[PDB]
Amino acid sequence: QVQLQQSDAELVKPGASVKISCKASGYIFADHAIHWVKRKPEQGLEWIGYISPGNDDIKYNEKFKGKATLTADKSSSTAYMQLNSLTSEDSAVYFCKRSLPGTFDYWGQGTTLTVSSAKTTPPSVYPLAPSMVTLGCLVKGYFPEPVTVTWNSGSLSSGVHTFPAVLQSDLYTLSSSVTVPSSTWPSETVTCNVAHPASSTKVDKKIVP
Amino acid sequence: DIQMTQSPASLSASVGETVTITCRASENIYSYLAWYQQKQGKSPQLLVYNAKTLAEGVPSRFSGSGSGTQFSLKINSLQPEDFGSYYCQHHYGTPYTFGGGTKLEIKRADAAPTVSIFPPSSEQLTSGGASVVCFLNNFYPKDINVKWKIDGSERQNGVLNSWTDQDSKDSTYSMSSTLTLTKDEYERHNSYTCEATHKTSTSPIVKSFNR
Amino acid sequence: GASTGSP
Ligand SMILES: *[C@H]1O[C@H](CO)[C@H](O)[C@H](O)[C@H]1NC(C)=O
Ligand SMILES: *[C@H]1O[C@H](CO)[C@H](O)[C@H](O)[C@H]1NC(C)=O
């Protein structure tokens, strides 16, 4: 029943501030400290700070002293991290996580912070139609990350590849392939499901011959 | 302010082998060392806390050992699903520093890419774009080359490539190559060709369509 | 002990 709710995505202009929320439920908020961890491609993991709401104990990694500001609303059992004076270096996945490593260890989904002048754009979803047959979706011209792809609402996941997004012309392009037996397609429906949280959009594209 | 040094940075091993990942602290941290698994797009999963104690749900083939400055994570009987990144983190005191991580690849038999090429959808053409997509699926090892040809002649501008992580069941890599054109450039040529060269063959694997 | 953290 334990949950740490984080938004999938924050988009913020360089030099601005962002307040990332971590909403705790399933346990008494004041029982555990909430830690913040940065995951940036090729910079592994980096501990930012904790706020222990029970006793108003806040501790920072020295690197993030002016950068990060931790607070908690005890009444709505939500931990906040505010990053200040944002640069492209601050673009990363920010996790909130409960307690120290131990029995209480629990992680949020992570918030993808993109620091950019560019504005949120929903994806275009294009069908890729051709023993086994390979189908795909091309997900083009969305901003910012992330996007999730599924096939037939997840009921088709054997021989699904989703390729990491590539940034071109300040827009992301991603593809996804699914391999099914020639008997199943096209007599049985094959549909890719593209969710873009930042734009509150889901697109279903049915792959037709 | 304790430096944490992890080794190796990266590692290839077969199903059934034992991998040993090392974490060394610059000061005594007693028992207060944790290990996390991370795969791309997912929250870090706690494997071990207090140097030796398995987290609920972690397979028993995982074992942490060590104390003071010298710690080890062993994965006995390595499985295809064990691919990914492994991080130590001390919980001695602030700052709770992470090691640099270890990327673990599963070694397996060679496998040739299954290659498929897709023309631009009509939907994309009516918006004024043209993207030609080539999937190179289920190959090992990771090293592959993709050459686009337009009307028999090589093209390297407009080409974006991305690789999947290793597959959790068959330990293969897949790769996507997209040649992005304007509708107008796409309609000035007929033959679009994707050519893959992998170590599993001397001659390239060739897929093409003709508008 | 008193509280988890240090250590
Ligand atoms: C240590 O663990 C306890 C629960 O066992 C609480 O979560 C406490 O807040 C933790 N301390 C820190 C600094 O996260
Ligand atoms: C106990 O105190 C330490 C600091 O000495 C941490 O703030 C810890 O989070 C506290 N425990 C709880 C449950 O708040």
CSV table of N, CA, C and O and ligand atoms in Angstrom, one decimal, chain A residues 30-33 50 52 54-55 57, chain C residues 3-4, ligand 2:
chain,number,residue,atom,x,y,z
A,30,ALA,N,5.5,11.1,9.1
A,30,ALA,CA,6.5,11.6,10.1
A,30,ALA,C,7.5,10.4,10.5
A,30,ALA,O,8.5,10.7,11.1
A,31,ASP,N,7.2,9.2,10.2
A,31,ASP,CA,8.0,8.0,10.6
A,31,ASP,C,9.3,7.9,9.8
A,31,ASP,O,10.2,7.2,10.4
A,32,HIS,N,9.4,8.4,8.6
A,32,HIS,CA,10.6,8.2,7.8
A,32,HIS,C,11.0,9.5,7.1
A,32,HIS,O,10.2,10.3,6.5
A,33,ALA,N,12.3,9.7,7.0
A,33,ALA,CA,13.0,10.7,6.2
A,33,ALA,C,12.8,10.4,4.7
A,33,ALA,O,12.6,9.2,4.4
A,50,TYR,N,18.3,14.8,2.5
A,50,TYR,CA,17.1,14.3,3.1
A,50,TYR,C,16.3,15.3,3.9
A,50,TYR,O,17.0,16.3,4.3
A,52,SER,N,13.8,14.8,7.1
A,52,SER,CA,13.2,14.0,8.1
A,52,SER,C,12.0,14.8,8.7
A,52,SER,O,12.2,15.7,9.6
A,54,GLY,N,9.5,14.3,10.7
A,54,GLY,CA,9.1,14.0,12.1
A,54,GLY,C,9.8,15.0,13.1
A,54,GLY,O,9.1,15.4,14.1
A,55,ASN,N,11.0,15.3,12.8
A,55,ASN,CA,11.9,16.1,13.7
A,55,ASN,C,12.6,17.3,13.0
A,55,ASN,O,13.5,17.9,13.6
A,57,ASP,N,14.6,17.7,10.7
A,57,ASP,CA,16.1,17.5,10.4
A,57,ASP,C,16.2,17.5,8.8
A,57,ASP,O,15.6,16.6,8.2
C,3,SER,N,18.4,7.2,16.7
C,3,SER,CA,17.7,7.4,15.4
C,3,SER,C,18.6,7.0,14.2
C,3,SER,O,19.8,7.2,14.2
C,4,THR,N,18.0,6.4,13.2
C,4,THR,CA,18.8,6.0,12.1
C,4,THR,C,19.4,7.2,11.4
C,4,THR,O,18.7,8.3,11.3
D,2,LIG,C1,16.1,10.5,14.0
D,2,LIG,O1,17.2,11.5,13.9
D,2,LIG,C2,18.1,11.5,12.7
D,2,LIG,C3,19.1,12.7,12.9
D,2,LIG,O2,19.9,12.5,14.1
D,2,LIG,C4,17.3,11.7,11.5
D,2,LIG,O3,16.7,13.0,11.3
D,2,LIG,C5,16.1,10.6,11.5
D,2,LIG,O4,15.4,10.8,10.3
D,2,LIG,C6,15.2,10.7,12.8
D,2,LIG,N1,14.2,9.6,12.8
D,2,LIG,C7,12.9,9.9,12.4
D,2,LIG,C8,12.0,8.8,12.4
D,2,LIG,O5,12.5,11.1,12.2
